[PDB]
Amino acid sequence: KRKVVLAEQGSFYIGGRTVTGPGKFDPSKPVIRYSNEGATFYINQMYVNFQAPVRPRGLPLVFWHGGGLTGHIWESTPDGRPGFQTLFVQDRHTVYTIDQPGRGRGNIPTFNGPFGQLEEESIVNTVTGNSSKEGAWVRDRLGPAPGQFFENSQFPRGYEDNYFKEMGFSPSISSDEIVDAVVKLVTHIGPCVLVTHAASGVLGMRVATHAKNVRGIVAYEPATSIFPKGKVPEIPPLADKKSQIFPPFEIQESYFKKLAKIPIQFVFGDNIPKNPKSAYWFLDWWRVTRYAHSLSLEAINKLGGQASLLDLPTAGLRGNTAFPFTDRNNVQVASLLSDFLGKHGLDQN
Amino acid sequence: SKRKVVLAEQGSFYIGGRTVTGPGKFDPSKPVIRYSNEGATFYINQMYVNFQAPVRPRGLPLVFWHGGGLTGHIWESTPDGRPGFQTLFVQDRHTVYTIDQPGRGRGNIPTFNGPFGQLEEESIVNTVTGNSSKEGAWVRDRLGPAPGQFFENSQFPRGYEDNYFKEMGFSPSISSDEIVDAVVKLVTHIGPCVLVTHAASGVLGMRVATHAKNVRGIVAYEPATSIFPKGKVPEIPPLADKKSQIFPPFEIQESYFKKLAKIPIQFVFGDNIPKNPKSAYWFLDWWRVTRYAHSLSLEAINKLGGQASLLDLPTAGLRGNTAFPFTDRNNVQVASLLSDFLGKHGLDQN
Ligand SMILES: COC(=O)c1sccc1S(=O)(=O)NC(=O)Nc1nc(C)nc(OC)n1
Ligand SMILES: COC(=O)c1sccc1S(=O)(=O)NC(=O)Nc1nc(C)nc(OC)n1
């Protein structure tokens, strides 16, 4: 189950821009300590890894990690089982995994000075944000409170340290620049399928509207809904009657309609409440967020699309967290992704 | 195919690090976003590790450790897309580990809710960062004597400059002790292994070996900081500008330094390091004196009974290598010399 035969593998950087410091660089002057004088800095570039099987079939898959993550989540589970990278190379697809700008091997744009500041210009904010272990526990629905697990959980219990160690902060890079890097990758690859997660859900939807080479999207537990500009439906607050979900992203309808040209599937795990849950903020957040996504998919279908919502429990899989592709039943989750690719001819040459 | 690779298994994991905690308690009924330090536990300073194991490995696993401001990408592929040492050594029947050290790449960058690196009143890492420029890295890596210029003999993959410089970035001020600690813990997990280091990781790998008997050999590409027994740093001249110096050598207790005499150690240097003072080109002159300091470090190890050697690639007939010989155009020939070292000491046998 672990063996993999690669026709080729490797990695590369793509995307990004340059910014410059004042003055001119003099090679006769001390180069250390590093200074901004005469400096050119490459910023906001993306890291890309690929593994190609012998005799690929169908389209390459681009796996795009969620917020605060890296391509690690597609390589292995926290307990060391094969991730989707291995499983899909075995399924005869070329697999790309990225570390988006600002994450992992992608660039973090900082210089000589306070974090993110190049002389007088703020490239990214000096003040950061980052989830705690406790916040991520409830966000990912391991259980209702830190330390607790839902009954029949598919989380790899005992590997909490491994799991939380994979997560971290992201600097305040413009989402436009993150989308731009992936558009450039899609142009380089050719026709492909995006597989997104959490924060990358909305970003992958945006990429597809700019890149006809995106031939399909599967989004695991996307975090932000998307609608045509001025056509956001009524969405209730959370059960605390104070909080809201993430403000839906609005795009021009001419771009939104591109989403109707390709098959799109949103995948949700288990333990999202049907009814208001005022005691557990992130559980209720998921209830309302999933509802908003259902309306987003309906809007795509009203433009002639083929957009679906797969709740894993309806397919017979119980206990999944917000990372179904690293849960204990991730082979079964992968089988459902293979089913989607096959139905839509994305596994054929 | 030169590009084909057969893996018995591959994967990645996190190892090492500690935790820090914010004030107060976490209440799951209160808004979790925007994220707060209240009731927060943060995992910090952990390391990312990738492994690829061939079918029927022969010899010891290799642990490739990137230089300063880099990641494991440099062992995966060259900037022009040719196979890196990860592929070459899995093809040479070694299990290959590649790391992103704490503070780099997929390793942790310890920051929270607040100014960079600050957890309430505690500074975990500095808010003020440092970072090389393209121009500084060009001359540091000896692509040529000045930015935009190549040595005539260069092995650099010209035309892929943007790709190359895009792989580099800043490092937060994590203590070197905590970086060494993470790799010691990895070596404990792996068992007997060989460290292959580069530039800033050279001195760190030397330190790891003094703490971890599982390190059975070291090959260091263009190490940046020399190491000596405490109180026994030899006289090292200033640079040709008469004012600058090389990196202050790291000093360790002699009982630890002596552990370096128990394993084979090779330092590998590329080309275009001047023999004579060169005041017009600061980093060329810096490499001249740094290489000299390393020669004295290796001699100190050998006087204690060691097996330490310096390989200048031009003496092996390879001309034009930069400070990243393992991504240069002749990196297959560089890899052959690494295979030769492993074979000489039986590190390629079970
Ligand atoms: C891995 O988990 C995530 O990725 C998820 S899932 C629910 C929440 C989160 S998260 O951490 O909160 N990330 C984000 O989705 N980040 C984010 N945050 C804001 C305020 N706006 C936007 O864009 C609209 N994205
Ligand atoms: C590939 O890049 C490097 O790795 C190299 S090589 C020559 C120089 C460099 S570098 O940038 O300067 N790195 C470091 O070696 N980092 C570093 N820098 C200072 C000021 N002190 C200490 O501590 C001993 N380490």
Author numbering:
A (entry chain B): 12 to 360
B (entry chain A): 11 to 360
Q: What did the original publication write about this model?
A:
SulE, an esterase, which detoxifies a variety of sulfonylurea herbicides through de-esterification, provides an attractive approach to remove environmental sulfonylurea herbicides and develop herbicide-tolerant crops. The structures show that SulE is a dimer with a lid loop in a domain-swapped β-hairpin covering the active site from the opposing monomer. SulE shows a similar catalytic triad consisting of Ser209, His333, and Glu232 at its active site.
To elucidate the catalytic mechanism of SulE, we solved the crystal structures of wild-type SulE in complex with CA, mutant S209A in complex with MM, and mutant S209A/H333A in complex with MM, SM, TM, TrM, EM, BM, and CE in the range of 1.29–1.63 Å. However, in the S209A/H333A-TM complex structure, Gly78 and Ala210 form hydrogen bonds with the oxygen atom of the sulfonyl group, while the ester O atom forms a hydrogen bond with the water molecule Wat801. Superposition of S209A/H333A-TM and P44R/S209A/H333A-TM complexes revealed no significant structural differences, and also no conformational changes occurred in TM. Different from the binding of TM in the active site of S209A/H333A, the ester bond of TM is located at a correct position, ready for catalysis in the active site of P44R/S209A/H333A. However, the electron density of TM is unclear, especially the sulfonylurea bridge and heterocyclic moiety, and the overall electron density is worse than that observed in the S209A/H333A active site, indicating that TM was bound more unstable in P44R/S209A/H333A than in S209A/H333A.
